[model samples]
Target chain A: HMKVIRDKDIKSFLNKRLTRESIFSQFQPVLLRGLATYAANPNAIVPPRIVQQSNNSESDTTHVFMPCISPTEVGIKVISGGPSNNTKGLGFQGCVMILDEVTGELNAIFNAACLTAFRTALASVLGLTRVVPVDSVDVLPELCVFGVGQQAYWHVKLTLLLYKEKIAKVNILNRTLANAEKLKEELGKEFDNVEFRAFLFEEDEKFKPHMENSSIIYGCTPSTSAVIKKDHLNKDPKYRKFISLIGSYKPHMIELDLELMNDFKNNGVKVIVDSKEHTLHEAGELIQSGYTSDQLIEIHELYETEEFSTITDATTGTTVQKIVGLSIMDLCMGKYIYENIQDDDAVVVNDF
Target chain B: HMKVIRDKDIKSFLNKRLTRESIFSQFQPVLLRGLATYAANPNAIVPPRIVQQSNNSESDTTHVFMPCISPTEVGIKVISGGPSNGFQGCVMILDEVTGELNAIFNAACLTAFRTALASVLGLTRVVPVDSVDVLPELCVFGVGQQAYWHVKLTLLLYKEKIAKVNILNRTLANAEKLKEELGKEFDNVEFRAFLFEEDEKFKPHMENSSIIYGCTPSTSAVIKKDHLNKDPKYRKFISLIGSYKPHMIELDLELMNDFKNNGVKVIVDSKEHTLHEAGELIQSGYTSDQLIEIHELYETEEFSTITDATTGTTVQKIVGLSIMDLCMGKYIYENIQDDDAVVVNDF
Candidate 1:
């Protein structure tokens, strides 16, 4: 029997796996290896993402087809999300399918909206780990995350879990205060030691100080213009921070301006991307900056590099990472969640 | 809520749709217009199929991604079918299945089968309903897998009603090979093979055959007007399945013009697709009015032209349809056996 893992089923499965520190630890290594394998192999088939506008007159519906393959597995994520869906009171329709590389047998199908949030956050932290080594830093710095939707919430939650010992506080910045305030109230109940603060984008002065002190910044907005400028980072030469831009994947959507990207490139800093080709094609900030593939280092390349310390040596000791998300990342996480989650809770389709 | 139907399920699904004649009868008109409407609209986005060869040394694996859309629904079929997997590695993970990948027959086989089915459906339009029992001679050009399926399915559907089948190809060896495989099942029916160079030997079969099936990917026209029956009253249906790309040609321009001049409107699956892709028609510069699409034909009138022994020839171009695949896929999915089908809840 083939399984249809709904959102609630995915949530329950995540609740169990979320507690394990090993899940986060194992996720980065798999993702890094997968990305590196794809980069090195010339024959790796990663087709350009396909976007199809729905033919319906009433609905401004669109479907996005994304396929990614590694040596281990091949997966595709097809999702429909648009403004017209709101008219019918429908949420974003998303699904993910994974297949075995050798046999081409489909392994699993997932509720992609949840899996996307999970893998996107995981890829973000994975990018962060490559820069700020857990053992090298004396204290885990505070986190200033932009956008308080599911993406922002997961980024904050995963960062707290991964860097529990060294972390101090989490500052959330959003266009409105409702989601951030609600997230703060919810997260406060679980972590008493960790302080949660929400900032409105209108109050620039209040958000600036926290942005400077924070060691990690998560950009997770759909803003078409640059959300952060060069001055947002601390001015201190030795102050190293990890910046993750997870939103604004399309060529027209922008989270960081070209000036900020130029600053990172001129400083001899390489932006780490989850998938090299995808970031080059879809990353709006990178495309506008006229950045070459050589200017940006991939997660897999970073993993395969022999002299790892040199990555943190130059360019103000800061890492500017942009992940547009890849199909392989979902393949890795889907495999992990499938194997680690309790078998009894999952409905398995044999001879699939 | 979604169903996952694999190859076995799909086979079972086909058994149901194929047993009843109503399925084929109802399938063509709906798909014909759906494909025509999609082709006519400039904004109707059906991206060129993407082919990606996998970087595996041990096996030659290739993935083909074909996404087609209509006003009512959108569907994509992704499969890894190539030389390595016995030419049958076709897996379609559809939305109706809630994205669970289902195994259909080998894509090469399905493609060949569907293209043949489409030609046969188009043939029925011109071949008058009363002539179902008439044992017509079929002259098929090409000896490849496509030609094999075209001949096999047509023979299977027509059975004893098909009196003689002639296979013509560049080489006699392949044609003989196809005849050998088919001869055992159809002992009563005469099967013949003719090399392309032996035009004198093949001319009689070409001129007299009631149905001509062209199944080769020829850059030049295989069927010229001079080689066909010239009698204006003798109605013969010539179905062309090859020549998919704009650079490929199967039917000669003279033959198409002769049919058009004789009041035989060329029936096509989609007028836009044929003009845009089929080289035979596009290179000939046939106008929109020169062609009669199946979509437009299905709506207006019945094809009841009298075969008063002089109506010349009718050429039907079957370039295939995405909506046909969609309909076939949906039919197979709906009738899939539930006993072996698994429904997984949590993953």
Candidate 2:
């Protein structure tokens, strides 16, 4: 017995209907507890990924196979090619195979692009809620995102859905002005009463003005050069700023400069990560700034204590979440989507 | 831009319609040419496989990935666990130009089918049906699909030449089970079933057999020299495809050393691979010089059967190469895409 969840089903079932309440009611607990369970014991839940680069005609193409086997869930996430080959613009157009927990037969195949991107976005919100509570603010805050990619769109999309009543505007900045304009156009049609403006990297006139005005900034591209620096933001207090670095997974690809990473560390800001060990090795800003293991906090650890300390270190006015991502999240999310998604929306193939 | 062929589809395409004529005419050349190309330069066509076991919870499970990058095709064989009720297998065929997933299929039969093809390819060379006036008795060890396909393909190729077929298994019921099963399909040949015992009545049939196929995962020697009915003037062809590890041997040391002492060079699928694996060669202290690689045999020399004047027993063993699977999987994928029932999924 197997089912197929295409990118279309993910859009149909989850794009508008998957809200904060929906996730917290059904999946967020499923997503977070596994993150916590995995945090308690990393080796117990998943193995380190097996990433094989295809020497096949294209030396740049890669197939990443990550196996996750828990007591209850078993499956693998296969990334066809990294973001570079993801020309379809869904976050990594690969497939996730869900196997039977007992027999280990394949149970399902899900198109990972939309579901996986949204899953990562949902995890970022876990850390985002712990750091900044935007519900109490009188005037709403603006969001400044780095790229016009899927990661940028989902991060902004989830953030807007969570803070739809309070958020004022969204600023999309990228190297290409047209793609950023295209992103604003896509998001513009969905949400009204929110000003969506696009800016280019070459045009710093509007980029800097929008960059200084936003309280939330999301970096979502694998840029060789740093996109945001310590001085790019307004130093003085405007509001509590949260930067979600869910992009730039490789050590060489820097989303934020060393100055910003160093400034955050020196200020005793405990930057929360989806995985502490994961981001320390992969997240560019953390690795370039030389942040050690003990200096950071994981998103799962926020649930360990009864009352969690705010990571937005009041004096510095900045909190962060850098998620290079883990296989357990996919495992948990796959199980959640498999069990919860309506059958009518999915294509169920007869016994595999 | 994705076409999916499941296990059922693979069965439908390969089970009934895929004949010996079809493979030799259409797919065997593709299989061998790619094998030769890969043998000539492995790194040029495909990289090494990446194997990682699933962690603590289900440590029994393993995921194996083999990638290929060559002139015409590009893909990876993604295998989960093992076979039949144990594992799942898939081949992701990508566009050589764009690296997009164009075709994917269940690979359970591909591995078994390709390995059998390689064994039979070696068998056809070692004991050509045209050489002898009539074929000798054929003895096969094990009752699994690997053994089943070897005998099936053998019958498909040289059915009129072969007379008697013997299936020796640890379980008599399984051997008898396979006996009636294949007997129903191939009625021309006389099929006999025997329990794999030292002092059983299986010795006479085993000795009389000129063609012996060992397809069991046994660590101990399953085939011994004394069991062979050695006719000094006649040649014998034995192929062992089951035993892969350096510790697993289907052919005993006595038989291997007998071949060594008699200056009989064993043929291997690959010298670099079988030197490390294949216990029969390793235990017998056989070097690369002592082995004739199939690729080198086909490419460098004429396709002629070697019949020694002293003791004419030639053995070939295959511990398969990944590129063979890569190319063959792509070949089968395209064939199915052109003419088989496929499940087209929106990616």
Candidate 3:
């Protein structure tokens, strides 16, 4: 038996399955644990994803395949990208083929849209909730989501889901005002209490206020050049927040300019990452800054060996989170989704 | 937006989508055309399938991905071998314009069916199933999935002309299991199995078979001249699909030379692939004249291609092509009933 699961089913599952508290208190921790185990466990086997396309330059259609295995779950993720997808408002679209690592029977197949977006956001949030002082007033006031793709959608959605009381306003800043407006339109309906505003990259006067005032920022774009400037968010020691860079996967692509990256490195704020080895090479911000592996720390390296509070002082300055996604993260979240999935949550096709 | 096809769905899609005659005589024989399209194209974008090993966390697993692009369709066949099953695979169907996926389907059923179906196609061209006056009985070596489908599909289409199905395996267990399971699906046709070279009647059954199928991976030849009981009136057809490499063989080298000596060209799925890959030919030191391809059988030539009128038995080898997966998958995708697969707009 194999299942075809949609994002709606996942959304429904999370809404009903989680009692709100468990998402942060329980669900988020389990996902983080998998990342830790993958980075910490010595015996795990995971391969770098194979990215391929026709050598002919006429068609830019590309496919990516990733295989991962752990003690509990395993399988491959197939992701495809095409140029015309911009019209469709989709960047990367594909499915995750989840199987029993030991038996090799396909357990479930689902859209990578929700799982990727959710897991990436979950990682960023995990780091945020960790380093942020709990006793304080939840000082993170505004959320700025740069680039209006699915990555931006989840970052804003998850923040509001977890911080509706602490954060009342959300700003979407993108190159195209229409894209930002579209994202603003969709998320606007979901959370009524939060004021959702859209901004264009061209209009600095309008976006600068919200972009700077935002204590939590997410950069989600496929830009080849730096989009975040150090001057945009002034280098003040008193200004403390979390800056997440999920875009700019290649060395040529960067979200934070060298000026901003150097400022963080100078302030002794080591970039928190899912894997130090991956982010060190693939992340343009790190590569351009020429940071050694020691200049960065993996999440597992921190939580496993050191106390959360001792690692970083909340009063010091802004902390940066850089993630180059992994398939092991998908395997972990896939197992969680499959195990919790109900009968109607999926449509099973009997190979029999 | 996409479809997740199961093996049953693949079988259903293939069986229902192509009307029986169209599979052989109509507009285009679905899979046979795949053969023509693949071989005829000058600049076909069919890359060699990639076999990669994943070793992490004490894990030792292998995955083979075969990518093919046709003007009408594009996709990749991802075959997986894990700690357990080896035949687990799927074809990722990409919508060319969007670069996004249209569907991801099980490749094992489609993969084996094309190999099995293509073999049967060649067998029919030689024996013509209903062409013979006497009822044709089949003797298959090995009770593997390939062997089971060989029998099931033989009975599936030519049940009227075929009177009995016999299976030969090293062990009697699975051969017996296949014999009974197929019995329920096909009761009108008699089913039988016996341990090869062990049972007393094995020699007798071997010679009695009119059509034989080789479906095991053996280093040496499993079928030889002594085992075949060729009838003068009813021409016999033997198709070997099990061994694919030069190191593996199912048909004896002597039998191949005899065919070449007797003016019979060993039929193959692809002469381009078989001459280099088939060990029976590679080991027998036979050249181009000794073998013919299914693509050349377009004449439906029974004279020069298959057994000579006097020649009784012949060998047909199939080392599968990547395009068969593409074309067959395209056939299923274009013709599969809409209701059979739910349309996924946003999952």
Per-candidate DockQ values are: 0.16, 0.28, 0.27
The alpha-carbon lDDT assigned to residue B215 of candidate 1 equals: 89
Tell me the tens digit of each residue's lDDT in model 1 across A1-352: 2344555666677665664366445766676666666667634556676777776566576767777665665666777766755345343566776655665545666777677887888888876765666555633367888887668877887788777776788988887788789888877886899999988877878878877787788899877887776677665547677788988778887777578777666665677887667888888888888888887777667666655443442544566788887776777677666666555555565443
Task: Tell me chain A's TM-score in each of the predictions.
Answer: 0.88, 0.92, 0.91
lDDT of candidate 2 over B107-144, digit per residue (tens): 66667777778877766666675666333678998886
lDDT per residue, candidate 3, B123-179, as tens digits? Answer: 766666467454457888887668866777777667678777888887899889989
- Sort every candidate by DockQ, greatest first: 2, 3, 1
TM-score of chain B of each: 0.76, 0.90, 0.88
Q: What does candidate 1's lDDT look like per residue over B1-347, in tens digits?
A: 45555545444444445522543455454456555656666345466666666554555666656665555435666666566533333334344312223323234444665676677776766664356434367889888767876776667566656778989988889899999877875787788999877889878877777678898878888876667776665567778888877888888887655545555557787777788888877776666776766655555663542122354566778776656565455544555566634443332
lDDT tens digits by residue: candidate 2, A154-195: 888888877877678899989778788989998999777788
Best by lDDT: 2
Worst 10 residues of 1 chain A by lDDT: A308-317
> Per-chain TM-score of chain B, candidate 1?
0.76
**Candidate scoring better on TM-score of 1 and 2:** 2
**All candidates' TM-scores?**
0.71, 0.88, 0.81
Model 3 residue A1 CA deviation (Å) reads 3.1
